Amino acid sequence: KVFGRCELAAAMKRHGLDNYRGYSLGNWVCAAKFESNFNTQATNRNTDGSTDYGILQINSRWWCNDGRTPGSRNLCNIPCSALLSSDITASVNCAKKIVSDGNGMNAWVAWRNRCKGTDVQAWIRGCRL
Numbered sequence: 001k002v003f004g005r006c007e008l009a010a011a012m013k014r015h016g017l018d019n020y021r022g023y024s025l026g027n028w029v030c031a032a033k034f035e036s037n038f039n040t041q042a043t044n045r046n047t048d049g050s051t052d053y054g055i056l057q058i059n060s061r062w063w064c065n066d067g068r069t070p071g072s073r074n075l076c077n078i079p080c081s082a083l084l085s086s087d088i089t090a091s092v093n094c095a096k097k098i099v100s101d102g103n104g105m106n107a108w109v110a111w112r113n114r115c116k117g118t119d120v121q122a123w124i125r126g127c128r129l
């Protein structure tokens with residue numbers, strides 16, 4: 001599924017991501033924009049052989065099982081495919097774990113490089129939330 005911007009904002013809020021660990025909703029929408037362009041089915045292979053899955057490009061090195069990332073963990077206790085669903089529940093639950101791991105949203109390199117410090121409220125501006 002390719003979400004609309006306000007549609008994704010609403011779904012993220014529904015699932016308790018808004019202000020989670022102090023990160024406003026626009027931070028999360030911005031991260032999703034640059035990780036996946038709001039496409040739940042996005043996948044990307046990393047140099048290390050891990051793969052990133054879903055709207056927040058959650059990595060199989062630590063967070064999910066895909067059966068083909070040697071030496072990896074599955075700390076969200078989910079198949080990586082669950083992260084591609086039109087329903088964002090599994091991505092949101094796993095993101096909450098990731099952002100609580102110590103480095104906040106810096107876990108998402110694209111957030112650090114493209115969202116951090118910017119006017120992230122623009123990503124939710126206009127939305128009925």
Ligand SMILES: [Cl-]
Pocket residue numbers: 004005006007
């Ligand atoms: Cl929109």
Ligand SMILES: [Cl-]
Pocket residue numbers: 005033
């Ligand atoms: Cl957009």
Ligand SMILES: [Cl-]
Pocket residue numbers: 024025026027120121122124
């Ligand atoms: Cl915001």
Ligand SMILES: [Cl-]
Pocket residue numbers: 060061064065066067068069072073
């Ligand atoms: Cl894996």
Ligand SMILES: [Cl-]
Pocket residue numbers: 065066067068069070071072
């Ligand atoms: Cl694996």
Ligand SMILES: [Cl-]
Pocket residue numbers: 068
């Ligand atoms: Cl393969």
Ligand SMILES: [Cl-]
Pocket residue numbers: 067068069070071
């Ligand atoms: Cl493996």
Ligand SMILES: [Cl-]
Pocket residue numbers: 072073074075
């Ligand atoms: Cl594990």
Ligand SMILES: [Cl-]
Pocket residue numbers: 065066078079080
């Ligand atoms: Cl699995």
Ligand SMILES: [Cl-]
Pocket residue numbers: 011086087088089
């Ligand atoms: Cl959803």
Ligand SMILES: [Cl-]
Pocket residue numbers: 021022103104105
């Ligand atoms: Cl933080």
Ligand SMILES: [Cl-]
Pocket residue numbers: 114
């Ligand atoms: Cl940018």
Ligand SMILES: [N+]
Pocket residue numbers: 013018019025
């Ligand atoms: N919010």
Ligand SMILES: [N+]
Pocket residue numbers: 046048050059061
């Ligand atoms: N990785």
Ligand code: NA
Pocket residue numbers: 001002
């Ligand atoms: Na689509």
Ligand code: NA
Pocket residue numbers: 049050051060066068069
């Ligand atoms: Na992989």
